[model samples]
Target: HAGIFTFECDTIHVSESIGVMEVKVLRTSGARGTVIVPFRTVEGTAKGGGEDFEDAYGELEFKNDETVKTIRVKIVDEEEYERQENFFIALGEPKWMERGISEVTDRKLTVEEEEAKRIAEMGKPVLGEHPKLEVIIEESYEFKSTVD
Candidate 1:
């Protein structure tokens, strides 16, 4: 039996005005263990740690019988006008993963592995599908009144 992990949606379109949004995740096929998977907030077209998006680093624990989980994340308010900005929510290796060849291959690295890893990694997940979630941020419409 193998448990599958993935996001409810691959992409999310959002506005800066209405924030504190909740993202969806699920465990299916073989939810028969106490599973723990940590998550990461990565920057795409937008910044992650430096302000565009808030802290969303967390660990998710799934019960043996539960099927889904909800995670709340605060999308920072936009003070400057910009085009569609974006970031991503990615999955880490689950404690009870059933499959992952790419995981241990690089841990003990050698043989000029730098060339293979040179293009940049972390774009894909080990035992999850659609783990890289696209979070798109549209321009805000907040009314600012400072001058008379």
Candidate 2:
């Protein structure tokens, strides 16, 4: 048995406003597996408040008896600039509710302050004025094999 999991993240631009892009997930593993996801962006705003990250989720597919795998995230850069365009991707695997056991889990343990501190530590750069694209494959794990 397998289920779906969803994770969300918000990134506030420090300097100028950046365009938000759609998110995609593709399983490179050879077995005819695929999943498509979307990401939202808050537009026309300064770097003061935050945005709500949405339209993101993952599908858990069963593999054999005791193992499972997820779709590989496909991130496309839609920002006008080649270097200046940059963003972050986060993955979570939260425990399932009383309904059933969710194949994926949420691990968003970082707080808002911590996130802000991180951005402060890595502020805008001097050179390379090209758009940037960043993807975070947060976590991955495999349990002991129950069957061969």
Candidate 3:
């Protein structure tokens, strides 16, 4: 009863609004072994990238006795409005088992932006002579995560 566990798919897209990405893994024969999945930031801020923080990458361990496993990846909340970002999670060979299989050798996690809110700020005007009263309009925007 020796086999492998595999990811449901090759890639997953999650909205930054979700705050976290949940990934699932499935086992074949329930053989006793360990699977370590390594991950790395593909695009975006990483350690020493001038963001003053360390890039996150780690090994996810899964036991063969388990039929299903779920892993969570935290999405960084950024203030800037930019294009989608992603990272890579690759499955490593199983240890103490005949062999481990990854249906998709590498999986990608993508972060998308949430819907934006529109805000308007109108400026106050002072009364003067009988001239064209001028009013200044200021505009801004706000965004709320769906997770909230």
Candidate 4:
């Protein structure tokens, strides 16, 4: 089965006050078996594990004719107002969950293998190496009481 996975869009925006962000892991073409997609919060203009956002790393499991999995990201909540920041979420190589079997399982192939072989392979990225998208964290317009 051919399951093409990619981001719905390149950019996703969320407010700082929200404390959490939901990203869409789009799946298309075919959905027959369980597909495991690994994701990581890559460092960019917005650094993780220290300030702007929380560093997240996990896998999204798409089961039985499933499509469009939601990845929830944790964000550091700050009362102080800061400028809008951005980060990146990149997808790693896909897995078949179990048996490690799927399309494109040939070994005696040469470098000059026809293009047809690649397309028939599951989870082939037409968008270059891997699918990565931008996560934009918007500034909080309103501030809550510092003291209670």
Alpha carbon RMSD to native, model 4: 8.8
Q: What's the TM for model 1?
A: 0.67
Return the lDDT, model 3, position 68: 68
Q: Which of the numbered candidates is closest to the native, going by highest TM-score?
A: 4
Which 10-residue window in model 4 sums to the lowest lDDT?
121-130
TM-score, one value per model: 0.67, 0.22, 0.46, 0.69
Output the lDDT of residue 91, model 2: 36
Model 3 C-alpha lDDT per residue in residues 91-114, reported as the tens digit of each score: 433343223332433434333311
Ranking by lDDT: 4, 1, 3, 2
Model 4, backbone clash pairs (residues 3+ apart or across chains), number: 0
For 1-148, candidate 2 gives per-residue lDDT tens digits of 1223232213223222222333332222221222222223322221212322232344343222312333332233223432332334433322222233233244344688465644433322121111122432112222343666
For residues 101-146, could you state the per-residue lDDT of candidate 4 as single tens digits? Answer: 4555564556665554454444333322337778777743333446
Model 1 lDDT per residue over 1-148, tens place: 3367788777777676667666788877567555678887877877567476686889887766666887666778865665677877887776643323244454444557664543223222235667666777874333334778
Q: Order the candidates by TM-score, highest first — what do you get? A: 4, 1, 3, 2
Clashing residue pairs, backbone N/CA/C < 3 A, model 1: none
Model 3, residue pairs in steric clash: none
- Number of the predicted model whose lDDT against the real structure is largest: 4
Off by over 4 Å in 1: 97-126, 139-148
